[PDB]
Structures are given as C-alpha cells and as structure tokens.
C-alpha cells in the first residue's frame, strides 16, 4: 500500500444508558434503555482513517475480555477495516470503557475506566511495537494513555522524520513538554486551548494568544478545533489559515467529530494534499460525521467525502 | 437421559465498576478499575446446576451483541456445559446488562437495563420453546423477565406434573397471584419474603408467620433463605426443617449465594434427596461460592459440595 497512518492510543466500550435520574447511594433504579458501542479516541481515529480507505494501523491495549472483543470486531476484517497487528490483549485488566449516564433531566454524567488504556502498556516499548511507527506515514496520539508512551512513540518517529499529531483530548493534567517539544502538530479545541494555556479563547483574538503561548513552549504547528465556527492551522511560520463549516442539512450527532476531523486531516496531509486542502477535507469528513448518530457508526466512507467536497 | 434442570430466566452482562463516590450531574469522574462478567440470576442459576454434573438446560433471550457472546461463552460447551439449544437472540435488542458502583463507602448503586431479558420474549410462548419445560425433571424461574412469560412456562409445567421453582430475586414489585398458584416452592430471602407478604422478618417467629401468609397466598413450599442465619424449608401442615449456614473459611464474596443456594437445593432435590439433604447440600455449596469473588466463577463442582459436607455434618 502506501505508508501507513499509525494510531497509537485509547480504545473504549462506551456503555450509555438512558436514565430519569441519576441513583441514590444504596439505590438500584432502571433505564429506559441502553446501548454499548465501540468508542475511545484511539479507535475512532483510526475506524474513521480505515474509512477513508487509508491503510490505517492502530496500536493499543485491551483486556481479553468482551468489550475487548467488541473493539477488535468493530475495527477489523469484519469492520472498519483497521489493522490491527499491533493491538495486545492482556489479561490482568479490563478493556477500558466509560459509564455514560444519560439523565433524563437533560444532565449528563460519565465515569471512566482507563482500565488496559491506562495500565497494560510496557514500562519500555516494545522494538516491534516502535516499527510500525517508525514506518508510519503519519502517527495519531491523544490523550488516553500514558504520557510515557506518548513520549516514546514521538522521539521514535522525530528521530525517523515521520509527521506526529497530537490530540489533546483526554486527561486534564499539563502536557509534559517533552512531548509538546517531540510533536509536529498539536490539536486542542478552544476548551482544551484555554485549559492548557490558562488564558481565555472567546474570540478568535485570544485563541491566536495562547496558540502563540503554545508556539513559545515549542510547537511548530496547532490545529485548533473550533466546533460550530470550523477550524484553524497556526503554523508559527506564518497566521492562521482558515476553514469554516461545511454546513449539515441535520446535525443528529456530534459525537465523533473532532476525532473525524482529526483522522481525516490526517490521512488528506500524508496523501501529500495541501494545507487547505486537509483543512476542507477534514471539515467535510467531520459534517457528514454529525448528519449520522454514534462515533463510528457515522464516520463517512471516502465515497461521500469525496463526493460532498465537490459542491462550491 | 435423565430429566434436565431447566431454567428460565435472565442473563446479563454486570458492569462493575469502583468509584470513591457516585458522580454529580455533569460531573465525568475516573473509577479505579472495573470488570464486566457473564451474570444475570438465570445464567448463574444454570450455570450452578451445570456445575454440579446435572444436565441443564437454560431458556433465556440475548441480543446478538458482544455480552450476548459473553453469556453464551460462559455457560455453554466450552464452559459450565449448559444447553443453549434454547437459547434464542434478537437484532432488535441488546443483551440485559447492568451496572455495579461500588462506592469507598461501602454503599452499592445499581442501574438495570433489562434488554433482551424484558422485551425480546414472545407475547405468546410456542410450543418450540415450551417443549423443553414440558420434558424437565424440574424448572427455575427467578423475577428477572415478564411475569406473563413466568407464567406461561410455569402453567406448562403444572400440566406435566412437574416441581417449579420460583427465585423472588430480581424485580421488587408485588407478584401476580396467578404466578404464585401456579408454582411448587417459592424462594425467597428475608428481606423478599417481607416486602412480599407485607410483613415483618425480624425474627423467626415473624418469619414463619409471612410464611404462613405466603401459605394462604397459594404456595404449599417455601425455601427461606436467611444470610448468615442459614436458611429454612416450610411446608404446609408440617414442621419446618432448619439449616445453619455451613461456615465458610473466608467469606470473600457473597455475589452469586443465594443463586448457588437455590440451584443447588433443585439439584438435589430433582435427584431424589430428603429435604433434609437438599438444604444441608445447598448450604455447603452456597458456602463454597462466597470463597471466591465472582458469581459464576466461584460455583463450586459436585464433589467439593460433598466433601464439605462429609467434614462438617
Ligand atoms: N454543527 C456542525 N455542522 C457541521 N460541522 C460541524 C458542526 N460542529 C462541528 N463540526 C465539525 O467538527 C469539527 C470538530 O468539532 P469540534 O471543534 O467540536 O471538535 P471537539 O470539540 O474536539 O469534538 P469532540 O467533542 O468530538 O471531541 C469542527 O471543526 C467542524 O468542522
Ligand atoms: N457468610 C456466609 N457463610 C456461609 N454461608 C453463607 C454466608 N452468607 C450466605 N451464605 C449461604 O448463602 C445462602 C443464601 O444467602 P442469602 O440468604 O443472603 O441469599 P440472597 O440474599 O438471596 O442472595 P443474593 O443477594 O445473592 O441474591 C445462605 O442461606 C447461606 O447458606
Ligand atoms: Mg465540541
Ligand atoms: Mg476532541
Ligand atoms: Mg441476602
Ligand atoms: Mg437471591
Ligand atoms: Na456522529
Ligand atoms: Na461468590
């Protein structure tokens, strides 16, 4: 094929259930019903690359264990078509996955596993897990495994002159600046922006301050994610180039957008298309992406994105 | 060959997770860890009676999901050696799940979706399904799927002549008359028995008055299961038989007790055994699983639950 995008990072079973009210301490309550679906960053990135027809890996971690098996059915042979040769099961922790209690009184509350995500990675990273992404055309990180491993992985692939973008999506703790230093492009939307920088990003004016903030503390290159009012790529070799929304007829569904937008501007920038191009293409990846309930159920085949960028 | 323990009933997917406290609305906080397992009181209870080398066979509704795969997995031939054969899966629904909180507190949180286990039953049970009730040597249902279909399996089996168990365990509504004239021993704990007869279980002689009410509710048997305090099997018009706990080493986890109890007892009890034996072998396997966390995973063999009793008559 072609070099290969390469995501390294989370895989979850998401477990919504639809509940009036959140339980009392002791109490045992119904739901109206529930549904549990294969979900994390790290998964959805790479089930949206594999859509795309991009030859897509994913590195990660599960439990062998059910939800373990619902990730690998979801992104494999019989799903997205991920490869998923450097995925390792284990078997002294679950599959990670997250609780999302959706209250009937519009309230929504989460509670989160890391689980194999968090704790079944190696102290040192294994040479077999580093030969993929030292083959990679381009890696993917985020946020919801270790630190450490991230670190690896980005000195592996600086070292091999492989193009690294991280999500910042995940735990909210700093970024170590190691890692901020051994990135290519950092990919914040203007929450995580804001949170990472301390300094507010209300308009687009402040947004540009912390990015410069972000370029200081050695990032060559942010990617912000700016929902409803598109996107923008601050290259501190330049100022900002823009993007807005490629409006949807119905938005169902954001859920899996910013993970879309990521992985398909990933996958336009190592089919070597330009800065604008990877922009738009991701934008029109991401609508079709909120036009469809669920993460992965939504991501759009190349076919549609292809077909949707052709409209003026 | 020999007629099969049938059950049926629920099978779940149970989610448990352990947080310091519940989380407020909004709030998205991080558990210590977590771990989902094949449960679900029909699923152990066949699973028990698989165990114990009685041919069972489970009755029950999966979504064709991946906990569907799960329960399947641990009950069938590469693991309890339950029949499955009647097992039955939907696309329309998933497979009942539920999740466990288990709070630094102590205090428990439980949130139930019923699933395949609530709506992907018939209105009307065929003659498919009931074929296997009709040929039990006994039957075990538990209140975790509709009344209407409790009912239905437990009229088929009273035309066969044949002993139906009724588990109170799962839903906490009040249940229809119809169901409890329809079966031979109702099973339920204190805490059960008082909810459903209305009446006090502080003590024994509170006890054997919501049993006598439970006596005038239809039901000539009833198997209380009394925790730490053992348990006791009334039937009407005679003296009720008493058993003390079988004291285990180490109570680790009491998850799945009262399922082994009650699977156990018709285990025996189908196998011909003096009630006396049938409570004494349900509590030494009821013993057994509350050494080892885990429902399903610690359902001890047959002939461990024999040896407990050899050395602790
Ligand atoms: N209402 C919308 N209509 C069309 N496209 C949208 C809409 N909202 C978001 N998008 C697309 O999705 C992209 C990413 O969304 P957003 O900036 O919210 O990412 P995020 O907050 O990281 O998302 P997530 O919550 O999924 O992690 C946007 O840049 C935009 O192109
Ligand atoms: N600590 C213990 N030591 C030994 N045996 C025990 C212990 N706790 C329970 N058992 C056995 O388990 C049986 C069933 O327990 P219990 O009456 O609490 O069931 P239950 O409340 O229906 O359980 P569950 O909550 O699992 O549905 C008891 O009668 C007893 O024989
Ligand atoms: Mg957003
Ligand atoms: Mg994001
Ligand atoms: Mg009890
Ligand atoms: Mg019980
Ligand atoms: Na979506
Ligand atoms: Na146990």
């Given at each position: ?140 990180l985020?946020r919801?495994?270790?630190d450490?491993?991230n670190i690896?992985?980005a ?11 991280l999500?910042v999506?995940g735990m909210d703790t700093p970024i170590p600046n190691e890692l901020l230093d051994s990135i290519?492009?950092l990919?914040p939307?203007?929450?995580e922006l804001?949170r990472l920088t ?16 972000c370029?200081?503390l050695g990032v ?93």
């Amino acid at each position: 094929m072609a070099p290969p995008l390469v995501v390294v990072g989370s895989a979850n079973a998401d477990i919504y259930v639809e509940i009036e009210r959140l339980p009392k301490e002791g109490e045992t309550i119904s739901a109206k019903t529930g549904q549990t679906l294969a979900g994390g960053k790290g998964a959805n990135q790479a089930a949206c690359g594999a859509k795309l027809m991009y030859p897509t890996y994913f590195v990660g971690r599960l439990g062998e264990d059910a939800h373990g098996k619902l990730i690998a059915e979801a992104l494999g042979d019989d799903g997205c078509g991920v490869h998923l040769d450097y995925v390792r099961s284990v078997n002294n922790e679950p599959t990670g996955h997250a609780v999302v209690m959706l209250q009937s009184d519009g309230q929504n509350s989460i509670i989160i596993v890391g689980g194999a995500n968090m704790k079944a990675w190696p102290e040192i990273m294994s040479d077999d897990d580093l030969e993929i992404v030292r083959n990679a055309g381009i890696v993917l990180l985020q946020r919801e495994i270790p630190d450490s491993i991230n670190i690896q992985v980005a000195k592996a692939v600086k070292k091999a002159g492989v193009p690294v973008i991280l999500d910042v999506g995940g735990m909210d703790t700093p970024i170590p600046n190691e890692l901020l230093d051994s990135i290519d492009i950092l990919s914040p939307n203007e929450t995580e922006l804001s949170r990472l920088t301390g300094m507010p990003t209300e308009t687009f004016e402040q947004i540009s301050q912390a990015v410069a903030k972000c370029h200081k503390l050695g990032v060559k290159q942010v990617l912000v994610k700016l929902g409803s009012k598109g996107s923008a790529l601050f290259i501190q070799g330049e100022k900002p180039i823009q993007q807005s929304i490629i409006p949807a007829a119905q938005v169902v569904d954001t859920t899996g957008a910013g993970d879309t937008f990521t992985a398909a501007f990933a996958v336009a920038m190592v089919e070597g298309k330009s800065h604008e191009e990877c922009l738009r293409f991701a934008a029109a990846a991401a609508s079709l992406c909120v036009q469809v309930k669920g993460a992965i159920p939504s991501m759009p085949d190349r076919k549609s994105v292809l077909k949707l960028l052709k409209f003026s």
